[model samples]
Structure formats: structure tokens, C-alpha cells
Target: KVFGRCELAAAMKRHGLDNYRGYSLGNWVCAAKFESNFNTQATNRNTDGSTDYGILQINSRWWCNDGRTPGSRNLCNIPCSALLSSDITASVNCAKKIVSDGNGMNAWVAWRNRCKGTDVQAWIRGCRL
Candidate 1:
């Protein structure tokens, strides 16, 4: 299981997210906190029957296929199961594509609601990135 925010940052950096596009590391960390609390296996089913997968909680309606669900665009070209692993390579790659698609971090509801304009520095408070 993932430890916490600081360690999540270290992992994201190791996975090449330290300077991803233009978003701050804290932004990614903060999103993860609200999305899945850093647990790679987390899943949340929406009221509309769509499911959010992995730490980034990529959506099944557009990002990945969960097999049991339909209407997935699979834009990331990887199965949703790939997103639920401790190895975040596929997840980060898909997240990059999502952010690059013009939404930036606003692609995440968590970021738009809580992290936007907030003191996200607390996410990396004592981390040694």
C-alpha cells in the first residue's frame, strides 16, 4: 500500500512527474490525496454506473475499460486494471495525456474543488524532492 503524501510525491517524481508539463508536484499529490488517499487499488463507482480507477481515479467512461462496464473510450489504450497497480507508469502516462488535452489539473474535480487557489504547498511540506 502507498504510505502518504510525501512518499507519493517521491514516487511521482521517480515516475517523472516532478516537472510534468507545467503543473506542480503538490498539485498531483493533492489530487491523489482526495482521489484515492494514495492507495493504488482504490475504486469509486459513480451514480451513473461509471467507475473511477486507480490513484488518479481515471474514469471508465472515457479513459479505460473495466470490462464489466461499457461505453469506455479507452483513450489511454490500456485496460483499467493497469491503473490499479502499485506500478504507476500507465496511470501517470494517462494522467499526462489527460492534462495535456487542455483541461490541465481542472480535469480532476478534486483539484478544481479543493486544490485550486489553495495553499497546496502543504502537500509537500517537508518532502525532500
Candidate 2:
């Protein structure tokens, strides 16, 4: 599933990310736009032999267990495939953990490069809670 801008905002908001760690829904929307373009099935292999999965591009090396990444932390305690599902519950849950347990939204490079300190509110301008 490829979520639209406002649609993704609603989903993230529904999952309690609206102000999670001080990141607004727009920040999340921006990260998703640059990370995986809100594509649930998106996957990106990193140079370190890790793979980023799902709309938020959860990493296999640290957050998810892909069975291929050596010594995976599996911090999120979930299969990487879970992040690929259209139901973003697992993805959002893991993302929340990443923020609290890891380094906030900095866990996502896309957020740092594209969303951090940017005018993210526009991404959720028309979104009505």
C-alpha cells in the first residue's frame, strides 16, 4: 500500500506518533515521503548488508529480523516482513520503539536529511486529525 500524504498522517496519528518525541505527523509524513514514498512493500539494501523495510524503512540489522542479517539485534522483536504489510500497525509500533529506545527520529536518515527542522507542517495542512 502506498499511502497518500494526508492518509499517512492519519495513520501515524492513529498510531500515536503525532507528537511522539516531539515529532509531528508532518515530520513522519516527510520521512515516509523520502524514505519509501509511503510504499508498504518498499525495501532498500544498505551498504552494511542490512535492509530497510516498509514505509518508514525499518532496518533489518537492528530493528527487524530478516534471518539473513548476521547478528541482528531484532530490537523490535518482529520479522522484517511485518513491516511490509499494508497494515502499518507493526511498523508504527516498531517505529515508536525506535524513537524511545533508539535516537528519536534520527534513527531514520531520511528524517534528518529531509524532515528535521524543515517546514513539515505543510505535509499535514489539510489533514483533519
Q: What is the TM-score of each candidate against the true structure?
A: 0.93, 0.96
Best by lDDT: 2
Regions of model 2 farther than 4 Å from truth: none
**Over the full model, what C-alpha lDDT does candidate 1 score relative to the true structure?**
0.88
lDDT of 1 by residue, 1-129 (tens): 675778889988888786687778888998999888999999999877889999999988888988766777889998888999988888999999898888888999998998988888799999988
Best by TM-score: 2
TM-score of 2: 0.96
Q: Cα lDDT of all candidates, in order? A: 0.88, 0.91
Clash number for each model: 0, 0
RMSD of each: 1.2, 0.9
Can you write out model 2's per-residue Cα lDDT over 1-129, one digit (the tens) per residue? 988888889988988898998888888899999999989999999999999999999999899999999879999999999899999999999998998875889888889988899999989988787
